[PDB]
Structures are given as structure tokens and as C-alpha cells.
């Protein structure tokens, strides 16, 4: 909804009232295996909810789909009302923001990603380039030894006032089919594309859950993703209103 006392908050909330269509495009190269992914779906920031289907448009995906979840749109996070002044991601819209990561897979290779997230008309677009190097051919990634699932996790967000943006580092644990875990250490920075002001947040976290599934009628290599992302970690207003 639109009704906030801060007109800067109102501007960003306005763009994300209702269901917004999403397009995702990724071009990737991991150890010289070139691939492309296209995704479509919709986001509903009121509930923190994304529903997306991704297709590998070059044939078989050379890495496991779960390793691409975090790469393949944090403006759809649900920020509670008392935290809306800390929503960097919507405040950068519609001009958008850049999201850069390095992801280190423990005892394996790394991904470097750069994405632009912005509106094209009514559609929110996430355009990504991914470069992966130093992977082991018989490791868990190029060897496809990961389970097709995704563990819930919390991620801390901090301002980077020098870059007028945010930074975040966090660990993802991917499940290996033998019951072990493959760690993926993420380093992330985001910066605005426009030159206007943005909301720089106090420290807080995002709580994320994802469900991965398959489309039984789809013969192409693909992933169906339901993702929820909710902001938390700042207590109400002046204090607690219920004591």
C-alpha cells in the first residue's frame, strides 16, 4: 500500500503494490561450459513471495540448479511496516541497482556474478553475467552431487555508506547426496544505478526459505522456485507496545 508518512518510502512501496511480473536472464560460463538461463514469474512484496520458473536455454545445465538460487531479486522481500525506512532495494527503483557477488565453494571453484536489477516498463528484470573458475571436474558442482533442495537461512544486511549501498556476507550450505554438506561462502555488494537518494539501512537480516520443484510437463532442463524473503531484526518503534 501507499500510506506512509515518509514520501520516500511511499514512492518505493507504490511500485511494489500488487503482483509484479519478473524476467530473469543469465549468461554463464563455468570452466568454459557456456550456458544461458531464462526465467519468468511474478513477485508479491506484500507477502515476500516470488514464484519463478527457470529454463536452461542452451541444453543441459552444467552446474546444479540449487547453486544458482541466490544468483537467479531482493526488492520483493517483505519489509515490516516499522522497517520500511530500511528497504534499500525498493528505494533504488525504478532506475535499479547492481548486485555483485563472489561465491566461494569450499574445496572447489568460485562464481563471480554481476547483475542489473531494474524495471523495463511494468516488468522487473534481473540481467546477470556469471563467470565460474577453478572447479573440479569430479567435485560436487560439476559432478552434480547436490540434492535438489534448499535450506532455510538468515542473512545479515549492512549499509556501505561510502558506496551508497549495502554489503552482505553469508554462508549457504548445500546438501550433498551422501548426507554431507557443500559450503558456499557468499560476498555481496549492491549499489544504485541512479544518482538519486536511496534508503541506507540499519543492520538487519533477511530470513529466506525456498522450495524447489519440477514441472512434470517440461522436457527442458529447468527449476521451479517458490521463494519467501522477510526482513527482521529491528524491534518495533520506540520500544515494545505490548508490555
- Quote the CA–CA distance of 168 and 180 in Å, as a whole number: 26
Q: Residue 242: what are its φ and ψ, rounded to 5°?
A: -115, 15
Q: What is the resolution of this structure in A?
A: 1.7
- Quote the CA–CA distance of 97 and 165 in Å, as a whole number: 9
Largest CA distance in the chain: 60
Q: Residue 225: what are its φ and ψ, rounded to 5°?
A: -125, 130
Positive or negative, the CA dihedral 170, 175, 178, 182 is negative
- Number of domains the chain contains: 1
How was this structure obtained? Answer: X-ray
Q: Which three cell numbers stand for residue 89?
A: 532495494
CB 123 within 8 A of CB 116: no
| β-strand partners of 155 | 206
| β-strand partners of 22 | 41, 124
- Quote the CA–CA distance of 22 and 124 in Å, as a whole number: 5
Residue 205 domain boundaries: 1-243
Q: Closest Cα partner for 106 from 186, 178, 34?
A: 186
Q: Which three cell numbers stand for residue 212?
A: 524447489
What's the CATH code of the domain at 84? 2.40.155.10
Indicate the burial class of 122 (C-beta count within 10 angstroms; 0-12, 13-18, 19 or more). Answer: exposed
What does the DSSP 8-state code read for residue 63?
A: S
User: In terms of DSSP bridges, do strands 33-44 and 49-56 run parallel, antiparallel, or are they unpaired?
Assistant: antiparallel
Amino acid at each position: 500500500h501507499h500510506h506512509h508518512t515518509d514520501p520516500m518510502v511511499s514512492k518505493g512501496e507504490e511500485l511494489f503494490t500488487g503482483v509484479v511480473p519478473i524476467l530473469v536472464e543469465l549468461d554463464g560460463d563455468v570452466n568454459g561450459h557456456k550456458f544461458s538461463v531464462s526465467g519468468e514469474g511474478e513477485g508479491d512484496a506484500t507477502y515476500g513471495k516470488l514464484t519463478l520458473k527457470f529454463i536452461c536455454t542452451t541444453g543441459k545445465l552444467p552446474v546444479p540448479w540449487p547453486t544458482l538460487v541466490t544468483t537467479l531479486v531482493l526488492c520483493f522481500s517483505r519489509y515490516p511496516d516499522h522497517m520500511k525506512q530500511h528497504d534499500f532495494f525498493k528505494s533504488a527503483m525504478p532506475e535499479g541497482y547492481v548486485q555483485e557477488r563472489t561465491i566461494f565453494f569450499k574445496d572447489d571453484g568460485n562464481y563471480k556474478t554481476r547483475a542489473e536489477v531494474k524495471f523495463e516498463g511494468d516488468t522487473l528484470v534481473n540481467r546477470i553475467e556469471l563467470k565460474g573458475i577453478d572447479f573440479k571436474e569430479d567435485g560436487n558442482i560439476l559432478g552434480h552431487k547436490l540434492e535438489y533442495n534448499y535450506n532455510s537461512h538468515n542473512v545479515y544486511i549492512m549499509a556501505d555508506k561510502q558506496k551508497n549501498g549495502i554489503k552482505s556476507n553469508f554462508k549457504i550450505r548445500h546438501n550433498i547426496e551422501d548426507g554431507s554438506v557443500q559450503l558456499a561462502d557468499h560476498y555481496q555488494q549492491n549499489t544504485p544505478i541512479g544518482d538519486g537518494p536511496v534508503l541506507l539501512p540499519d543492520n538487519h537480516y533477511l530470513s529466506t526459505q525456498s522450495k524447489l520443484s519440477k514441472d512434470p510437463n517440461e522436457k527442458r532442463d529447468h527449476m521451479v522456485l517458490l521463494e519467501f524473503v522477510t526482513a527482521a531484526g529491528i524491534t518495533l518503534g520506540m520500544d515494545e507496545l505490548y508490555k
